[PDB]
Design an enzyme around this catalytic site. Structure first.
Site, PDB file in Angstrom:
ATOM      1  N   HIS A   1     -17.321   4.436 -25.664  1.00 33.92           N
ATOM      2  CA  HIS A   1     -18.724   4.431 -25.196  1.00 33.92           C
ATOM      3  C   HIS A   1     -18.786   4.944 -23.754  1.00 33.92           C
ATOM      4  O   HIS A   1     -17.750   5.300 -23.192  1.00 33.92           O
ATOM      5  CB  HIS A   1     -19.368   3.036 -25.369  1.00 33.92           C
TER       6      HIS A   1
ATOM      7  N   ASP B   1     -15.854   2.422 -17.422  1.00 28.33           N
ATOM      8  CA  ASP B   1     -14.530   1.878 -17.716  1.00 28.33           C
ATOM      9  C   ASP B   1     -13.832   2.596 -18.901  1.00 28.33           C
ATOM     10  O   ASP B   1     -12.607   2.559 -19.013  1.00 28.33           O
ATOM     11  CB  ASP B   1     -14.592   0.355 -17.953  1.00 28.33           C
TER      12      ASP B   1
HETATM   13 ZN   LIG Z   1     -19.350  -1.110 -21.522  1.00 24.35          ZN
END
Ligand SMILES: [Zn+2]
Ligand code: NA
Ligand code: NA
Length: 230
Positions: free
Chosen positions: A83, A87
């Site tokens: 996604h 991160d």
């Molecule tokens: Zn996330």
């Protein structure tokens, strides 16, 4: 012996072998003044490797490539980000400069661009509707529906019955769904149900953060998110 933050200094990366040709990578992050471990996946494909998710940021991701060369000694040729959050895409530029072909869904790429995050090079089509699944080297990519984010993908390794959930799946010790700013709490339990229905033979489930376990991480995740929604 799965490593925790007590075994991985901030900024270090470790690998953990889950099965033949399947590893998780574990990196300790420092974010908003908290320190925690993040998981991703490595899957062997012939004499090459497929990487799922970065180690968050340029330095960690370079350290990840170094650790892979030391421990496994096969080149990473492709990577997928599950996604758009920094991160999971942060470090894509390091990967790309190193010759790794980087991939994400069009939705992930748009959202990353709009956020000012690093952007995987290639689009993965065929993942825009809940329940959609595509083969990609030695894994299946699955879009379960909105959960932790609207674009989140999960990854199944058919040969090993290993499911990597990214941040759409929580560890058993978790009591909260974490950062829900971009989450769909109303949809998330339904998205988990799709995963349960599609991968009933999963033996190992790897959460986005924390300890792997069995299929119960999925039901636990649904329970936590439902309880959160209060
Ligand atoms: Zn996330
Ligand atoms: Na970090
Ligand atoms: Na972000």
């Amino acid at each position: 012996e799965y490593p925790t933050v007590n075994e991985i200094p901030v900024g270090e990366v470790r690998l953990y072998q889950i099965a033949d040709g399947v590893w998780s990578h574990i990196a300790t992050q420092s974010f908003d003044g908290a320190v925690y471990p993040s998981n991703g996946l490595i899957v062997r494909d012939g004499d090459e490797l497929l990487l799922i998710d970065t180690a968050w940021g340029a330095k960690n991701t370079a350290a990840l490539l170094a650790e892979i060369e030391k421990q496994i000694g096969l080149p990473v040729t492709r990577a997928v980000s599950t996604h758009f959050h920094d991160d999971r895409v942060g470090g894509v530029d390091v990967l790309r400069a190193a010759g790794v072909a980087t991939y994400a869904s069009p939705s992930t790429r748009r959202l990353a661009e709009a956020e000012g995050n690093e952007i995987p090079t290639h689009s993965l089509e065929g993942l825009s509707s809940s329940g959609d699944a595509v083969r990609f080297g030695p894994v299946e990519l699955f879009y379960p529906g909105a959960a932790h984010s609207t674009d989140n993908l999960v990854v199944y390794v058919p040969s090993a019955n290993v499911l990597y959930g990214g941040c759409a799946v929580l560890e058993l010790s978790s009591t909260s769904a974490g950062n829900v700013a971009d989450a769909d709490l109303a949809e998330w339990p339904t998205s988990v149900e799709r995963i349960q229905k599609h991968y009933p033979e999963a033996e190992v489930v790897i959460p986005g953060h924390g300890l792997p376990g069995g299929l119960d991480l999925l039901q636990h995740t649904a329970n936590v998110v439902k309880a959160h929604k209060n």
